[PDB]
Amino acid sequence: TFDMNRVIDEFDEMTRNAHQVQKQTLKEILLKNQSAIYLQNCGLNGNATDPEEAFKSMVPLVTDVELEPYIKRMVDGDTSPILTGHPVPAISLSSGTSQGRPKFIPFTDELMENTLQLFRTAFAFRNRDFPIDDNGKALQFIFSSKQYISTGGVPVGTATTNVYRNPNFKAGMKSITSPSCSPDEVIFSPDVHQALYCHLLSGILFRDQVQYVFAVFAHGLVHAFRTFEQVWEEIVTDIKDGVLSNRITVPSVRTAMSKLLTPNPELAETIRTKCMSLSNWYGLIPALFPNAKYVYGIMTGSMEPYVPKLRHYAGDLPLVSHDYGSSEGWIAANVTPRLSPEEATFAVIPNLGYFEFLPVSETGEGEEKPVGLTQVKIGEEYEVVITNYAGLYRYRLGDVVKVIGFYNNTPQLKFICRRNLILSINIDKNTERDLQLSVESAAKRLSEEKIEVIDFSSYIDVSTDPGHYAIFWEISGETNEDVLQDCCNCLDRAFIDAGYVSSRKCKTIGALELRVVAKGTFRKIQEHFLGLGSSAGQFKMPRCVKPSNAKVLQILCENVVSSYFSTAF
Amino acid sequence: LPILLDYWPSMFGMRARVALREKGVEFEYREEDFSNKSPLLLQSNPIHKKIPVLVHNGKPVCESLNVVQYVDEAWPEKNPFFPSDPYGRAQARFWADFVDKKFTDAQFKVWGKKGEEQEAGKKEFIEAVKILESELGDKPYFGGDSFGYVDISLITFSSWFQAYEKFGNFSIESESPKLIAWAKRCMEKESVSKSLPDSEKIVAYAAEYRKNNL
Amino acid sequence: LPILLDYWPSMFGMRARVALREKGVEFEYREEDFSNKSPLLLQSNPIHKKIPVLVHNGKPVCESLNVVQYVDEAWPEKNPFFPSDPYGRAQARFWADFVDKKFTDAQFKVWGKKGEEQEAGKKEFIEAVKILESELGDKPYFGGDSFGYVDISLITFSSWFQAYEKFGNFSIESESPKLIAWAKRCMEKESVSKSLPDSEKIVAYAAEYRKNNL
Numbered sequence: 001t002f003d004m005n006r007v008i009d010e011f012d013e014m015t016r017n018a019h020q021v022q023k024q025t026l027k028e029i030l031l032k033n034q035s036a037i038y039l040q041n042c043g044l045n046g047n048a049t050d051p052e053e054a055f056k057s058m059v060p061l062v063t064d065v066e067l068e069p070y071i072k073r074m075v076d077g078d079t080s081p082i083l084t085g086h087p088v089p090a091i092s093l094s095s096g097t098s099q100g101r102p103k104f105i106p107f108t109d110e111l112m113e114n115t116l117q118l119f120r121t122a123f124a125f126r127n128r129d130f131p132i133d134d135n136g137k138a139l140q141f142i143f144s145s146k147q148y149i150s151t152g153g154v155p156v157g158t159a160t161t162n163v164y165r166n167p168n169f170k171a172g173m174k175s176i177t178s179p180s181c182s183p184d185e186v187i188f189s190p191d192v193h194q195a196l197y198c199h200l201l202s203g204i205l206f207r208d209q210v211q212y213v214f215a216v217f218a219h220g221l222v223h224a225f226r227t228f229e230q231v232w233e234e235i236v237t238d239i240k241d242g243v244l245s246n247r248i249t250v251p252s253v254r255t256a257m258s259k260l261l262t263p264n265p266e267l268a269e270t271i272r273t274k275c276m277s278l279s280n281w282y283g284l285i286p287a288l289f290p291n292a293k294y295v296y297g298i299m300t301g302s303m304e305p306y307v308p309k310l311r312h313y314a315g316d317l318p319l320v321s322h323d324y325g326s327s328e329g330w331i332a333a334n335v336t337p338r339l340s341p342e343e344a345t346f347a348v349i350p351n352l353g354y355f356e357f358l359p360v361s362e363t364g365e366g367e368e369k370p371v372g373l374t375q376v377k378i379g380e381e382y383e384v385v386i387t388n389y390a391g392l393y394r395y396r397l398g399d400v401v402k403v404i405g406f407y408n409n410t411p412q413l414k415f416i417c418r419r420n421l422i423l424s425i426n427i428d429k430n431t432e433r434d435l436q437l438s439v440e441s442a443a444k445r446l447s448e449e450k451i452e453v454i455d456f457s458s459y460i461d462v463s464t465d466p467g468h469y470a471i472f473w474e475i476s477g478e479t480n481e482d483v484l485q486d487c488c489n490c491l492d493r494a495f496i497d498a499g500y501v502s503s504r505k506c507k508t509i510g511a512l513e514l515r516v517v518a519k520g521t522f523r524k525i526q527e528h529f530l531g532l533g534s535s536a537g538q539f540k541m542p543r544c545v546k547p548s549n550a551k552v553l554q555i556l557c558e559n560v561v562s563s564y565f566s567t568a569f
Numbered sequence: 570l571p572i573l574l575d576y577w578p579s580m581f582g583m584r585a586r587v588a589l590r591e592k593g594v595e596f597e598y599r600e601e602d603f604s605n606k607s608p609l610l611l612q613s614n615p616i617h618k619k620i621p622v623l624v625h626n627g628k629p630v631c632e633s634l635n636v637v638q639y640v641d642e643a644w645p646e647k648n649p650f651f652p653s654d655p656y657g658r659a660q661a662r663f664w665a666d667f668v669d670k671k672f673t674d675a676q677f678k679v680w681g682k683k684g685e686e687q688e689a690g691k692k693e694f695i696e697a698v699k700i701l702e703s704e705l706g707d708k709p710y711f712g713g714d715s716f717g718y719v720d721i722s723l724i725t726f727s728s729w730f731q732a733y734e735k736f737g738n739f740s741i742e743s744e745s746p747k748l749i750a751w752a753k754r755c756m757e758k759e760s761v762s763k764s765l766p767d768s769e770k771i772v773a774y775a776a777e778y779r780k781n782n783l
Numbered sequence: 784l785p786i787l788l789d790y791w792p793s794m795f796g797m798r799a800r801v802a803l804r805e806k807g808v809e810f811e812y813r814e815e816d817f818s819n820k821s822p823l824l825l826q827s828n829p830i831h832k833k834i835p836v837l838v839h840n841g842k843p844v845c846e847s848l849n850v851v852q853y854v855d856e857a858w859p860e861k862n863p864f865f866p867s868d869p870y871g872r873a874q875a876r877f878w879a880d881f882v883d884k885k886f887t888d889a890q891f892k893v894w895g896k897k898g899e900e901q902e903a904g905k906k907e908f909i910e911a912v913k914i915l916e917s918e919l920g921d922k923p924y925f926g927g928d929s930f931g932y933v934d935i936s937l938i939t940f941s942s943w944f945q946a947y948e949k950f951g952n953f954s955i956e957s958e959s960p961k962l963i964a965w966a967k968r969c970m971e972k973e974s975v976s977k978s979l980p981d982s983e984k985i986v987a988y989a990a991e992y993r994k995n996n997l
């Protein structure tokens with residue numbers, strides 16, 4: 001149960017317990033996971049008076065390629081305990097690409113334990129700095145709307161799907177966050193873009209009591225706000241007569257919204273009078289919820305260009321930055337949320353796992369052994385290696401962080417990265433120029449409708465016979481079935497190589513399936529990626545996904561606004 | 570060659586069998602007529618008259634846990650069941666004893682009873698199921714880096730997961746894909762490949778046990 | 784220093800105490816109001832909330848036979864309760880397992896209940912003390928040539944003998960003498976000489992719970 005003062009004092013106690021907690025964390029991790037096969041290769045049985053030393057002296061640092069076969073084994077019909085243990089409920093994918101190939105990583109309920117405690121922790125620190133009403137709400141542009149089963153029959157996916165569909169999410173987050181504006185259905189609605197507009201709407205419907213605006217990214221907020229600048233005429237009209245726009249066509253959400261709709265003339269007059277005042281949207285974020293005392297986002301790294309427009313969006317509202325870490329292994333919590341975006345430093349939490357940092361100080365790159373958490377010298381930049389329950393043991397994620405200070409007994413971490421740049425020939429191609437090419441040429445059909453395609457990803461299914469490649473699209477707006485059917489056909493027509501033709505024209509692999517998804521899905525992808533515990537080098541996102549990709553994988557399915565195989569063929 | 574006093578449906582005997590096979594020994598499997606128990610059985614464990622009972626060199630080892638431990642110690646040269654540390658052996662022991670006490674009784678309720686014991690039995694099944702899953706953290710096996718003592722103790726129950734699946738009117742997998750699936754991974758090794766009798770056979774005779782007494 | 788969560792009339796706790804004192808370890812004992820179980824104890828076993836519990840190096844050790852096995856494994860250089868052979872270990876384990884089945888239940892039935900339940904329990908315990916008599920045959924101690932695993936396991940039941948003798952108004956000595964005889968024989972070990980509280984009091988505990996449930 002939530003409290004700020006005790007929770008902060010146990011944090012002061014824990015952070016001060018940084019070495020003790022990191023090592024004990026190792027102990028529970030090894031003891032819980034003694035049976036792992038890599039470990040048998042490694043020669044480890046637990047206990048001993050050199051558990052940490054044995055830890056760093058017996059098993060080599062793993063890479064995604066080496067990880068991929070076993071994890072592949074956990075997902076493709078052989079429910080198999082591997083580099084972690086018990087068959088994981090869901091699986092993850094990290095930024096960059098494993099040889100350009102997709103990457104698969106383990107998930108467990110511990111991700112929820114850590115997630116819950118971290119948000120409780122952070123909300124306590126933030127509300128400490130930024131107090132909120134007990135009876136208010138939070139504008140959360142959050143989404144976890146897609147559920148599907150991988151080929152093996154084991155669910156595979158995103159941190160968000162699992163975090164909001166987890167039985168514990170509603171109960172766990174009810175006390176420590178302000179009541180969500182959006183009905184859980186709209187959040188889990190089969191149409192995310194329609195859900196973004198609706199989310200804007202829901203978010204916009206009780207603002208008098210809003211404590212803050214939420215998106216995990218400054219650019220996320222940027223999307224919601226530019227989109228805000230992309231639909232309020234329609235918004236006022238939809239809400240005005242009490243009849244929602246023809247733009248949204250999914251029944252669960254439509255029925256849900258119509259439950260809360262009636263004709264009200266005046267509000268239009270009001271909304272209309274104020275938003276005109278903005279000189280072109282200067283700091284409208286405070287204006288729409290006049291009482292939020294902050295803007296919650298991740299505004300560093302790949303987002304540094306985006307904070308000013310968010311500031312441009314936020315106006316004079318303070319910018320608070322999100323804690324760092326993922327289900328892959330959480331890392332740090334922002335003890336000092338009120339800090340400026342250009343100086344945001346986040347405090348590592350000790351039991352999330354056991355991490356080590358690989359230095360860069362020789363030239364580029366150099367050869368120094370990984371050293372202890374506080375052993376890391378101030379001011380220099382170290383890449384991050386982590387051992388946790390996330391199934392990832394001693395793995396090189398290849399991204400650099402800089403330590404600038406210490407909170408109590410723990411270090412403070414800052415990031416300046418962009419992309420985790422080590423790339424090798426990818427197999428989920430269809431040369432990326434061609435994948436991008438396909439999206440570009442086909443999307444022109446969607447470009448006739450005053451909307452430009454935003455982002456995309458592709459998939460390969462070995463379950464179906466013949467297997468069908470699945471391409472997904474993030475876009476500016478809603479359109480009917482015919483055009484997207486033409487778009488699928490066009491993607492098919494687009495990969496110009498002699499091979500794709502030999503196959504598909506032959507029949508050995510099925511008609512390319514265009515499962516047009518909804519907007520923000522890639523945005524979610526970005527949002528979980530930059531946030532992962534490592535360093536800011538986490539945004540060169542994967543184009544095509546094979547059996548081994550996962551984070552785009554829960555996202556692809558339930559919210560397929562349109563799922564169609566080529567009319568051609 | 571070692572003589573295994575075993576029963577076709579008995580889980581624990583299945584543990585014995587999976588253990589000897591997993592390690593790397595060639596032994597003889599003996600089925601039994603409880604109606605007409607063999608002279609060897611009656612001499613080997615007269616009071617209990619229960620299986621498993623392995624006669625090795627002329628020395629009979631009853632009990633599945635006792636027999637798996639025995640397979641381990643008489644022949645501990647390649648695929649060791651227990652971890653080297655005493656506390657580790659301890660964890661395997663505590664957990665194996667665990668599948669064998671509360672879990673066993675409850676599943677016993679899930680296939681052999683009616684009325685309230687059935688409903689109670691299913692509930693205890695889930696509550697128990699999460700706990701074993703809960704201690705697991707995320708461990709591929711239980712006893713050692715590969716096949717283990719606790720692992721040996723609970724694997725035979727993999728056969729019974731299908732029975733619980735329909736008879737218990739429950740899904741051990743939808744709520745806990747983890748355990749049954751763990752068993753599926755454990756079904757790639759030859760030991761469980763041939764040790765555990767067909768899932769369908771176990772379920773049908775189980776229903777039959779229900780038919781024979783009221 | 785090792786710490787033990789113990790109950791004054793706990794044969795189980797006594798299993799632990801006899802074992803630890805037996806090897807050669809200085810330790811601490813803490814009595815438990817089971818009505819209010821200890822934070823260290825609840826931490827040891829959150830669900831069972833059952834003793835005896837030995838804590839070493841920060842790890843709670845649970846279950847009686849497990850605790851004694853823990854005793855042998857904890858300091859493997861001076862006093863072993865087990866014989867060198869694997870089969871011997873198996874015989875001892877088999878017998879200790881015998882100690883925990885119809886035997887615990889049997890005494891539990893005689894001191895525990897009355898009437899219809901009582902006689903069933905009476906014949907069960909006499910029969911059990913008798914089979915025990917048969918396996919004992921001659922040995923000073925069953926666990927092996929010297930004080931062993933099982934010795935610690937079932938010697939502890941002897942203090943309750945007074946209770947069983949009076950409640951069922953029996954005299955287990957005439958039908959099976961060597962058991963009780965050997966029991967006070969084992970009383971000589973410094974392991975059980977101090978760990979186990981007096982019989983009149985245990986019997987008294989038996990008087991008190993019997994007083995409540997009538």
Ligand SMILES: N[C@@H](CCC(=O)N[C@@H](CS)C(=O)NCC(=O)O)C(=O)O
Pocket residue numbers: 576579580581603618619620621632633634
């Ligand atoms: N806890 C014992 C169980 C022994 C047991 O109860 N066996 C049962 C069936 S597996 C038996 O032999 N019943 C005799 C009968 O059915 O007549 C073990 O670990 O083996």
Ligand SMILES: N[C@@H](CCC(=O)N[C@@H](CS)C(=O)NCC(=O)O)C(=O)O
Pocket residue numbers: 790792793795796817831832833834835846847848
């Ligand atoms: N198998 C356990 C059983 C021990 C046992 O029965 N302990 C009793 C002491 S009389 C107990 O803790 N009862 C507590 C309760 O009923 O919750 C062992 O031998 O350690």
Ligand SMILES: CC/C=C\C[C@H]1C(=O)CC[C@@H]1CC(=O)O
Pocket residue numbers: 114115116118119216322323324325326527528530531532
């Ligand atoms: C601990 C909560 C789990 C996810 C929290 C996420 C949000 O929804 C805001 C930030 C955070 C993204 C990140 O910290 O990596």
Ligand SMILES: CC[C@H](C)[C@H](N)C(=O)O
Pocket residue numbers: 158159160161163216326524525527528529531
């Ligand atoms: C709450 C979910 C967070 C943002 C996670 N990193 C995700 O984006 O899936």
Ligand SMILES: [Mg+2]
Pocket residue numbers: 158159160524525526527528529
């Ligand atoms: Mg995401």
